[PDB]
Design a protein around this ligand. Structure first.
Ligand SMILES: [Mg+2]
Lengths: 322, 50, 147, 222
């Protein structure tokens, strides 16, 4: 009784506005008030799944340092405003929105071409100001989902992303929580005293729902705590590995090599679906195919062999797993 | 006059507000001084040196 | 196994290069140097560690040694490469071997500021503060009490 | 991806068999401090244990005296008992007696035992003694509570004492850098704890982890 105390629960999701929200957890025995409050504040501020804009491309732009006859703000200000946009997506983990406007007016959020799953949170968010009469802005916006925050240059993966000069890279700053205050107070509970009703107030982007964010943060915290809820000598290092030598290409099919679909159906019609079983396909066992000229054979030799392998090798590792 | 102005706002005259470390979660004693100071950035940024 | 491929790899920064570097400098001392090296301490040695950004972190006490303020004062670095030199730098000019200034045998590593304030505030005595008059079963006990 | 990085610890160092130093690596960019802080605040205050809280020496009914029979002023004996850890199973409260005659120093091994309770370090030197003819008679009421309960607020004759219900003598934690293969930096946690010898440190850590999981239970959904 005096030990093995009770446990809290979420009793209210009172939202004083569309953004400012308040939740009340109760009860907390003692000290758990400040403890849980600070811990949840840290978790919330740190990592909540956001969905801010990450990529844009406009027609007339060649670099974010340009201008565009007709729009009041410069391109860079449009980038900053876009970054300021707040949106939620539900099903997918990324989406490509489109915004087309023409004529004088303040181009705002709601004037984009929303899909069925994407949902703007506040319409009057000003994106730009079309001030010339027959000015036209048509832009595409890749909006993705992630965790935490990431700058622009740190997103570099290859050179094809920057290949289209129209690519503009806004630094994604998605974290639906903007400020998180909390405080405890004496809860006039059923029969006890000094049980602490904790109140958490959150100013957020209207992207995340209060109870949603609370339960997501609680799951994160409970899982990360579970890592040493039964801590031990789990220490990782090991040695003397025996690895399946075959390259993962062999598991993959032909279409995992960027080949012409004609040669794909050709090796279909010549008993080739895997890649570990087309290396078990002699060189005479390829050109017999219905209607191989050189082009389909070009793709074959290119994405099968010329990438490092042969057009059929007498190998004896496959199958080690199939 | 600065005291009068702070008094116009709902902020304490002493220009000192208690805080709470985000690490510990507890408070500091000795109410710290917090305001809005102007801050520049000089063209001595590290990229030109390292 | 070829220097050309080595340059390629160090140009591609595959994490293998990262932990290889981490291992290769595990004990490899290096030399931090103020711009005007007034006296013998102007150049000293340290075992480096890897951080981010482009700045050179260093212990505070030794920055007070160099007369090194943090007003943007630039410091140079110098890796000693031959084995004799590395062992030398570990033996002589590593900071942990220069605490008495060769000018005067007074300790050159003195906590200057922002740490002396801390202790002085800690080792003070408010007359009637919360908890006065108790009895504590050891320093760890009082520490638990305060935390 | 919203799927975090759970640590893969490397060491559980157990110097002195009661003073452990666990390390964890890696954590998120800020999780180090949050987990350390939550665990410390729990272990210090909210950690059910057992300690002595009431004392009565049938001669000295006073908060002060100089009781002949030992070379220890009463306050010293009380401070020495305040650390006398003792583990009690399903019983919730019990008084103990310490009738030990003779010459030498009073140790806990002389404590008149019970059926359920257990003394952790009977070699605990309670108090020394006059070189002749002293059987210090005292009853000590122990309890099972939450954590620190100072004797000041205990006032609500007798002789109280600042109880220390929690089984941790001290706890600290430091968060250092921890590199992942290319990732810039992460939090490597180092928790150093010295316990009251009634339970191993790792036991206390897992106990606090369990207590916080039970706190959270009504929120997670997996
Ligand atoms: Mg300077």
């Amino acid at each position: 009784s005096v030990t093995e105390f009770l446990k809290p629960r979420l009793v209210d999701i009172e939202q004083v506005s569309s953004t400012h929200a308040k939740v009340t957890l109760e009860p907390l025995e003692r000290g758990f008030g400040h403890t849980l409050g600070n811990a949840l504040r840290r978790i919330l501020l740190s990592s909540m799944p956001g969905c801010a804009v990450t990529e844009v491309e406009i027609d007339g732009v060649l670099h974010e340092y340009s201008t565009k006859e007709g729009v009041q703000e410069d391109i860079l200000e449009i980038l900053l405003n876009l970054k300021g946009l707040a949106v939620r997506v539900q099903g997918k983990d990324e989406v490509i929105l489109t915004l087309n406007k023409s004529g004088i007016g303040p181009v705002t959020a709601a004037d984009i071409t929303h899909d069925g799953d994407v949902e703007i949170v506040k319409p009057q968010h000003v994106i730009c100001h079309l001030t010339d009469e027959n000015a036209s802005i048509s832009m595409r916006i890749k909006v993705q989902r992630g965790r935490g925050y990431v700058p622009a240059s740190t997103r570099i993966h290859s050179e094809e992303d920057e290949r289209p000069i129209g690519r503009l890279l806004v630094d994604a700053c998605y974290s639906p929580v903007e400020r998180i205050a909390y405080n405890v107070e004496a809860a006039r509970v059923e029969q006890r005293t000094d049980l602490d009703k904790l109140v958490i107030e959150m100013e957020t982007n209207g992207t995340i729902d209060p109870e949603e964010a609370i339960r997501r943060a609680a799951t994160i915290l409970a899982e990360q705590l579970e890592a040493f809820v039964d801590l031990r000598d789990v220490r990782q290092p090991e040695v003397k590995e025996e690895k399946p030598e075959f390259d993962p290409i062999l598991l993959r099919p032909v279409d995992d090599l960027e080949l012409t679909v004609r040669s794909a159906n050709c090796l279909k019609a010549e008993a080739i679906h895997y890649i570990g079983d087309l290396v078990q396909r002699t060189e005479v066992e390829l050109l017999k195919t219905p209607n191989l000229g050189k082009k389909s054979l070009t793709e074959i030799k290119d994405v099968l062999a010329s990438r490092g392998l042969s057009l059929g090798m007498r190998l004896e590792n496959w199958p080690p797993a199939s | 006059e600065i005291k009068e102005l702070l008094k116009l706002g709902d902020l304490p005259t002493s220009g000192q507000i208690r805080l709470y470390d985000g690490r510990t979660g507890e408070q500091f004693e000795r109410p710290v001084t917090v305001g809005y100071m102007y801050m520049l950035k000089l063209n001595h940024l590290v990229d030109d040196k390292m | 196994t070829t220097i050309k491929a080595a340059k390629k790899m160090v140009e591609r920064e595959e994490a293998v290069v990262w932990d290889i570097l981490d291992e290769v400098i595990r004990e490899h001392p290096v030399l931090l140097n103020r711009a005007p090296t007034l006296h013998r301490l102007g150049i000293q040695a340290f075992e480096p560690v890897l951080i981010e950004g482009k700045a050179i972190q260093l212990h505070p006490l030794v920055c007070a040694a160099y007369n090194a303020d943090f007003d943007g004062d630039q410091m140079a670095v110098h890796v000693p490469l031959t084995l004799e030199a590395q062992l030398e730098a570990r033996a002589l000019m590593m900071s942990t071997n220069n605490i008495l200034s060769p000018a005067n045998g007074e300790p050159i590593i003195v906590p200057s500021q922002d740490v002396v304030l801390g202790l002085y505030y800690m080792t003070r005595d408010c007359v009637n503060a919360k908890g006065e008059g108790m009895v504590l079963t050891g320093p760890k006990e009082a520490e638990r009490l305060y935390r």
